[PDB]
PDB file of C-alpha atoms and ligand atoms in Angstrom:
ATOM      1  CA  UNK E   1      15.088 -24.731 125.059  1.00 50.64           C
ATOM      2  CA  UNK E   2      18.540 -23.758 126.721  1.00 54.45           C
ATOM      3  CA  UNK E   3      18.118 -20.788 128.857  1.00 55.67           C
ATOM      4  CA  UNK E   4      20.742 -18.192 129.580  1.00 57.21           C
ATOM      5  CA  UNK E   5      21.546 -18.020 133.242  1.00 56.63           C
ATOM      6  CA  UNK E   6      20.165 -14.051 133.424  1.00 53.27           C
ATOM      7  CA  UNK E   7      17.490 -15.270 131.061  1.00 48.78           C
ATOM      8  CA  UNK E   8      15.944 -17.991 133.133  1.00 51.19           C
ATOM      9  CA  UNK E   9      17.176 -15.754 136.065  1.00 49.66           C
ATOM     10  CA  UNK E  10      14.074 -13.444 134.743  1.00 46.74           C
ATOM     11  CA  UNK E  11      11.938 -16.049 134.024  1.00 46.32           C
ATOM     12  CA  UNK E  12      11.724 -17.136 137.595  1.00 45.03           C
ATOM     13  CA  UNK E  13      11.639 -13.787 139.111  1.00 45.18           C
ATOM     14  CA  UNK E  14       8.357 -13.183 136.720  1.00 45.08           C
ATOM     15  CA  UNK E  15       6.817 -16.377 137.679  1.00 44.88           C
ATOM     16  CA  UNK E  16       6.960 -15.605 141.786  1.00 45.48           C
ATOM     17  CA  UNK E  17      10.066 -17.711 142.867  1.00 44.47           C
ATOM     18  CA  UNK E  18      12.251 -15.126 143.704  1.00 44.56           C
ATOM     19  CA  UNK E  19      11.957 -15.589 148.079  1.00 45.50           C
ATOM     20  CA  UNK E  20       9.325 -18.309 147.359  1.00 45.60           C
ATOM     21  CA  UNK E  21       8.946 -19.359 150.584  1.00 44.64           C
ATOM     22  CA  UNK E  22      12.239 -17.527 151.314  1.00 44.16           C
ATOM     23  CA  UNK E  23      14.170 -18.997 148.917  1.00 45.87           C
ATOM     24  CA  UNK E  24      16.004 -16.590 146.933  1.00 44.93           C
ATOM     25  CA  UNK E  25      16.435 -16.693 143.195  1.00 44.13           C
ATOM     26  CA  UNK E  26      19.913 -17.586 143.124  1.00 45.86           C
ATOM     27  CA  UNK E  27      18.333 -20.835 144.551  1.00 42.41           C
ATOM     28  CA  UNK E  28      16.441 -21.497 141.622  1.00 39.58           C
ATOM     29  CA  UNK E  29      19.162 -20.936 138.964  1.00 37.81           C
ATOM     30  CA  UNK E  30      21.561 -23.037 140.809  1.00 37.67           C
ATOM     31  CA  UNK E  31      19.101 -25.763 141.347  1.00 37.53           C
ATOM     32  CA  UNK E  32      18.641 -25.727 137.373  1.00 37.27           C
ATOM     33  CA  UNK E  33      21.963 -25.868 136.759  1.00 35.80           C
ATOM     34  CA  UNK E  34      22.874 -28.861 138.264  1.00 40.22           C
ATOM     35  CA  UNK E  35      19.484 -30.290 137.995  1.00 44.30           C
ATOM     36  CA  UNK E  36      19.335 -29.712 134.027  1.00 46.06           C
ATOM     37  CA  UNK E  37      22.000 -27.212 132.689  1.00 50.08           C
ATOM     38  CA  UNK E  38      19.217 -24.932 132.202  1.00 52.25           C
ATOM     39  CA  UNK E  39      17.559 -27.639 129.082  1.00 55.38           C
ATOM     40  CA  UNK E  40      13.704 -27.699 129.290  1.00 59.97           C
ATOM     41  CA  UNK E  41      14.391 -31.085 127.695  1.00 60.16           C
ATOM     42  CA  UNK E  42      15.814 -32.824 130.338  1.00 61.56           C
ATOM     43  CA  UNK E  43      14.779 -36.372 131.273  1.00 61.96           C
ATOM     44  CA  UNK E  44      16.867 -38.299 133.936  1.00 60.55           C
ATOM     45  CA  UNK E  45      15.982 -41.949 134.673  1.00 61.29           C
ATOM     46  CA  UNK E  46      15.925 -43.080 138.409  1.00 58.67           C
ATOM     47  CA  UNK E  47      16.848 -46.580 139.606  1.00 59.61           C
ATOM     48  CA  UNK E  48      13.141 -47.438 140.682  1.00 60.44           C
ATOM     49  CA  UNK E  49      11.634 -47.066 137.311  1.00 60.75           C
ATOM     50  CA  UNK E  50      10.791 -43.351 137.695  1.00 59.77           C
ATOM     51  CA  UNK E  51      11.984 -41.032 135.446  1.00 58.83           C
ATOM     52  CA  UNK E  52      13.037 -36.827 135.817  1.00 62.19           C
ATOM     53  CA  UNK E  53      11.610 -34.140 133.940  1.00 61.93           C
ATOM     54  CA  UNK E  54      12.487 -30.429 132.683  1.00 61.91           C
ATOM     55  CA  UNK E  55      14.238 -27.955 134.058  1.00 59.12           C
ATOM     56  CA  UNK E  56      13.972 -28.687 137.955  1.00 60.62           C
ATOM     57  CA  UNK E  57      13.693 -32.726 136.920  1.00 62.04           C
ATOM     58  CA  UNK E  58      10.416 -33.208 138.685  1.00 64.59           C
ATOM     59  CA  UNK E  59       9.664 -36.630 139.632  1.00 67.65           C
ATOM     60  CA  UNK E  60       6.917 -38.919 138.383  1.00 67.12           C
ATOM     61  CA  UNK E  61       6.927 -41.261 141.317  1.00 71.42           C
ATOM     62  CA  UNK E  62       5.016 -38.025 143.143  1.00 74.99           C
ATOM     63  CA  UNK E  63       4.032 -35.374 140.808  1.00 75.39           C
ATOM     64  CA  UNK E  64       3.318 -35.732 137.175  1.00 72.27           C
ATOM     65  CA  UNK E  65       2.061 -38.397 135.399  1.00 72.65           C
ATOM     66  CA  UNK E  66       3.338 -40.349 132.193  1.00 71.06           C
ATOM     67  CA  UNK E  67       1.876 -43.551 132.049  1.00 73.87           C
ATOM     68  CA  UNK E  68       4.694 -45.875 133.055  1.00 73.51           C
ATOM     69  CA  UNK E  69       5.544 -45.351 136.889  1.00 75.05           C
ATOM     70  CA  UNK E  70       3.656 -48.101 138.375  1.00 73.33           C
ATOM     71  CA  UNK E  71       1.855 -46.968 142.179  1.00 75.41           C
ATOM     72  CA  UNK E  72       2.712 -43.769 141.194  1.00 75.74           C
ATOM     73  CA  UNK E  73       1.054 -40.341 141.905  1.00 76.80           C
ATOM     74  CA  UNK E  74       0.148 -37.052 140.115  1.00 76.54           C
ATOM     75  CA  UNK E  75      -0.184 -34.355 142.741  1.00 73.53           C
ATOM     76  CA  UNK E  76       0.987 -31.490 139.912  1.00 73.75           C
ATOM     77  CA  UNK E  77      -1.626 -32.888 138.000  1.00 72.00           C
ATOM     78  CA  UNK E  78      -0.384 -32.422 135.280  1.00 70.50           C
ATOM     79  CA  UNK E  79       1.257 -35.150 132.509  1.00 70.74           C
ATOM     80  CA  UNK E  80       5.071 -34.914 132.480  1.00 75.13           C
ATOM     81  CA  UNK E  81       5.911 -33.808 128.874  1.00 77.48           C
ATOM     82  CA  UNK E  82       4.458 -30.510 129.867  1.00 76.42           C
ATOM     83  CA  UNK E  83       7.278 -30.154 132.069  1.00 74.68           C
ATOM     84  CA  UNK E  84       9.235 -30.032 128.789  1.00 74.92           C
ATOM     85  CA  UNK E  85       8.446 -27.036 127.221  1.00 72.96           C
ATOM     86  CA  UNK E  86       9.991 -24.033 126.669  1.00 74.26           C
ATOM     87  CA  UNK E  87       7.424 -22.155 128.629  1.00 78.14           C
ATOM     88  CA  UNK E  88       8.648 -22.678 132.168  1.00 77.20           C
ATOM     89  CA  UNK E  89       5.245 -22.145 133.709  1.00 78.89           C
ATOM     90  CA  UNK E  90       3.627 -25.524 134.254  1.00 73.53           C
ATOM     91  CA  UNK E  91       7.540 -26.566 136.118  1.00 71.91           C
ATOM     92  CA  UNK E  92       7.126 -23.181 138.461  1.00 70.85           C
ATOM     93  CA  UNK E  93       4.125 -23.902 139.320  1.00 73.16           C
ATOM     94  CA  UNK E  94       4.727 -27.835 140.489  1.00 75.16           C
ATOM     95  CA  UNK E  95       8.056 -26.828 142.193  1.00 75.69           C
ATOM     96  CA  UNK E  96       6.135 -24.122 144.079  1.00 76.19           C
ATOM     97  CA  UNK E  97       3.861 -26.724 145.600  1.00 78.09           C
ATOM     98  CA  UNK E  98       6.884 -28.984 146.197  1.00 77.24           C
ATOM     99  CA  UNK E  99       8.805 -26.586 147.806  1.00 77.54           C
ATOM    100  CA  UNK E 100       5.569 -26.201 150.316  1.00 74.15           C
ATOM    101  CA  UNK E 101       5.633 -29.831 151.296  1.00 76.29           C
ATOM    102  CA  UNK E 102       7.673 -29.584 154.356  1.00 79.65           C
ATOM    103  CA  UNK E 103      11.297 -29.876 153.273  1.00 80.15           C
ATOM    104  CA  UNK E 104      12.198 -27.159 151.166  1.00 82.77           C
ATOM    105  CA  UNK E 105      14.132 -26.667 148.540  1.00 82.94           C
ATOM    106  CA  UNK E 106      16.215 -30.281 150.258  1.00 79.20           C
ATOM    107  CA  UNK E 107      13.671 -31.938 147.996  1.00 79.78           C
ATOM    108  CA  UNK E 108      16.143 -31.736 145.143  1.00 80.76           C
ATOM    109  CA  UNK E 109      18.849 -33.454 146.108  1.00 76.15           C
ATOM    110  CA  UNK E 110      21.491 -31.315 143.824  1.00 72.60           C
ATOM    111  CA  UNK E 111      20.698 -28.483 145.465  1.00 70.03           C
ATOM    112  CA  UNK E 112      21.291 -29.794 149.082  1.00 69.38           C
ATOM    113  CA  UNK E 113      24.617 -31.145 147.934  1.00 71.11           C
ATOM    114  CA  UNK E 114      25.697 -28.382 145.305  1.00 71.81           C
ATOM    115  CA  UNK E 115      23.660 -25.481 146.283  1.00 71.37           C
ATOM    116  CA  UNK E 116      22.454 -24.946 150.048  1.00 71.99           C
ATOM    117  CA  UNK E 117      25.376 -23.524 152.123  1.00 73.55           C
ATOM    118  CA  UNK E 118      27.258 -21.752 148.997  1.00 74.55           C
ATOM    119  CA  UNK E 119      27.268 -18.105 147.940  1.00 73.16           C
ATOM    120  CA  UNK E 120      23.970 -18.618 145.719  1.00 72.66           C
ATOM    121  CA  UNK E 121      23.230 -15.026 144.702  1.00 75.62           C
ATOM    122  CA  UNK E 122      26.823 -15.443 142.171  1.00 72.54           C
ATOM    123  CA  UNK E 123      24.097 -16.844 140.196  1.00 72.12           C
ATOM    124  CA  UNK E 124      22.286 -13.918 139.357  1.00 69.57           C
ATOM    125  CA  UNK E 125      25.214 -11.749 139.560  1.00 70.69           C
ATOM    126  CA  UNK E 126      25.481  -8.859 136.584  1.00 69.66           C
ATOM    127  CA  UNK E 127      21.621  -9.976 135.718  1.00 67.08           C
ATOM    128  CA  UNK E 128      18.933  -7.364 134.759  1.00 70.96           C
ATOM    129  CA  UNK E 129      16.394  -7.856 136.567  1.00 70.82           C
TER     130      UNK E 129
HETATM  131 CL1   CL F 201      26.096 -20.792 133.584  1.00 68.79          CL
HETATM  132 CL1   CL F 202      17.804 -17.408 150.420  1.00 66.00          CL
HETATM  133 CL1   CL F 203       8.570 -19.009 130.382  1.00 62.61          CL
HETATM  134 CL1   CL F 204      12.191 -24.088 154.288  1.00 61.00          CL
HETATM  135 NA1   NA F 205      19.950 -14.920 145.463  1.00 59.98          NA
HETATM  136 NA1   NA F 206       3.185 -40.301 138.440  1.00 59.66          NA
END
């Protein structure tokens, strides 16, 4: 699925994110939309054999499994294709415990060069939420 900005904008804000540890949602949108232009169907290949996923392109060298990222771990426990799906839940939930593992939201690298420092909150702008 292709969200609307306003559309995953309420998504988010539904699924606890909005000041998740005190990251605002504009955070979250403008994460997506470099990370993914807001496709659930996003897959991204990285230069050590792991691959992206979803919206927020979670990583399966850490935290989903899909059976081809030798040494790799799981610790969303989850297998990556769910990350896929239009239901945004199962990639909320994982980003919430990534964004608790000591270095914030810098954990996605598009947001720390794209994102962080910039007026984020244009990104929910005119939303009803
Ligand atoms: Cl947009
Ligand atoms: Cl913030
Ligand atoms: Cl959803
Ligand atoms: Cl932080
Ligand atoms: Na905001
Ligand atoms: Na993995």
């Amino acid at each position: 699925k292709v969200f609307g900005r306003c559309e995953l904008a309420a998504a988010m804000k539904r699924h606890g994110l909005d000041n998740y540890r005190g990251y605002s949602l504009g955070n979250w949108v403008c994460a997506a939309k470099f990370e993914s232009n807001f496709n659930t169907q996003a897959t991204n290949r990285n230069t050590d054999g792991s691959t992206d996923y979803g919206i927020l392109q979670i990583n399966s060298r850490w935290w989903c499994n899909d059976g081809r990222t030798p040494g790799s771990r799981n610790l969303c426990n989850i297998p990556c294709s769910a990350l896929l799906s239009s239901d945004i839940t199962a990639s909320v939930n994982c980003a919430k415990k990534i964004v608790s593992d000591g270095n914030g939201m810098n954990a996605w690298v598009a947001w720390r060069n794209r994102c962080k420092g910039t007026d984020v909150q244009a990104w929910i702008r005119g939303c009803r939420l």
